[PDB]
Amino acid sequence: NGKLRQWLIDQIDSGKYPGLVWENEEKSIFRIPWKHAGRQDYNREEDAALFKAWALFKGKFREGIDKPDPPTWKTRLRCALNKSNDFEELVERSQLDISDPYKVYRIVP
Amino acid sequence: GKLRQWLIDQIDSGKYPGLVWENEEKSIFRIPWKHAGRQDYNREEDAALFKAWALFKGKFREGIDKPDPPTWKTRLRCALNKSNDFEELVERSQLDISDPYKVYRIVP
DNA sequence: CAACTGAAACCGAGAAAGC
DNA sequence: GCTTTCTCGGTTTCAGTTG
């Protein structure tokens, strides 16, 4: 019944999202860009796309029908990653204080 | 079932603020439906109603079970959804107001 | 309250339980 | 034969913080 595990694996594999990449050969640890909106280096097409893609996939946001609320899209994916036991953040590897910020996640088998 | 007559009694009783009839024929009613605060369920004006369903059905025994209001809410919500005796008038429900509530018609 | 956050409350739906 | 409750996998809100 779940969807997030296979969905996010597919997005990483797709190569459509520049910072979203595997960090080991085993495809069990990945990087996910995590840029604050409103900051000077924030590309709102490119840094919202994965979050928007999840809201589109799950039917929460419908292009042309619903009003975009990108911050809401981010909150959804963060909270889903937090609650899912298929994903656990490697907090000591995440880097949120630099110019290209990112989180690091491990996928539970 | 048990829920149909029980909820009618609760509305008729006047014991729960906001649990009230909307028409003379006593077929449409409002049930307050507020999101809880941080372990603050008193802002829910009908929080008593969720506890009452759990007691009536023996699901909560005072002094034995841990109070679990969030769970009490889900039981009544899910019971209403599946029940063929209560049917939500979604076009009348008001979840976005300061004293929010849902509206239900009772099926004959 | 602009964007952001963890914790918690919240949800529908189907499987399971219950009478 | 029918009526609620448990389980699940995320979602949204609370009450604050700038993660």
At position B1, the amino acid (one-letter code) is G
Question: Are A60 and A76 a contacting pair, CB within 8 Å?
Answer: yes
Residue B80 CA to chain centroid, in angstroms? Answer: 9
Expressed in percent and rounded to 5, the helix, strand and coil fractions of chain A are 30, 15, 55
Breaks (C-N over 2.5 A) in chain A follow: none
Question: Are B27 and B12 a contacting pair, CB within 8 Å?
Answer: no
Question: Are B78 and B70 a contacting pair, CB within 8 Å?
Answer: no
Q: Which two tokens stand for residue A46?
A: 């490119």
Question: Are B18 and B30 a contacting pair, CB within 8 Å?
Answer: yes
Measuring alpha carbon to C1', the residue closest to nucleotide D8 is: A1
Instruction: Give the closest nucleotide to A36 (alpha carbon vs C1').
Output: C3
A38 CA – C2 C1', rounded, Å: 8
- Cβ burial of A55 (10 Å; 0-12, 13-18, 19+) is buried
Q: Which nucleotides of D are covered by protein (CB under 7 A)?
A: 2-16, 19
Can you tell me the distance from the alpha carbon of A55 to that of A70, in angstroms, rounded to the nearest whole number?
10
Residues of the domain holding A53 = 1-109
* Strand C–CB B71 distance below 7 A: no
Question: Are A68 and A45 a contacting pair, CB within 8 Å?
Answer: no
CA angle A66, A68, A73 (to 5 degrees): 110
Q: Which two tokens stand for residue A78?
A: 């963060």
- The terminus-to-terminus CA distance of chain A in angstroms comes to 16
- Look at residues B18, B24, B11 and name the one whose alpha carbon lies nearest to residue B102: B18
Q: Which nucleotides of C are covered by protein (CB under 7 A)?
A: 2-15
B44 CA – C12 C1', rounded, Å: 22
Number of domains composing chain B: 1
Question: Are A11 and A50 a contacting pair, CB within 8 Å?
Answer: yes
At position A107, the amino acid (one-letter code) is I
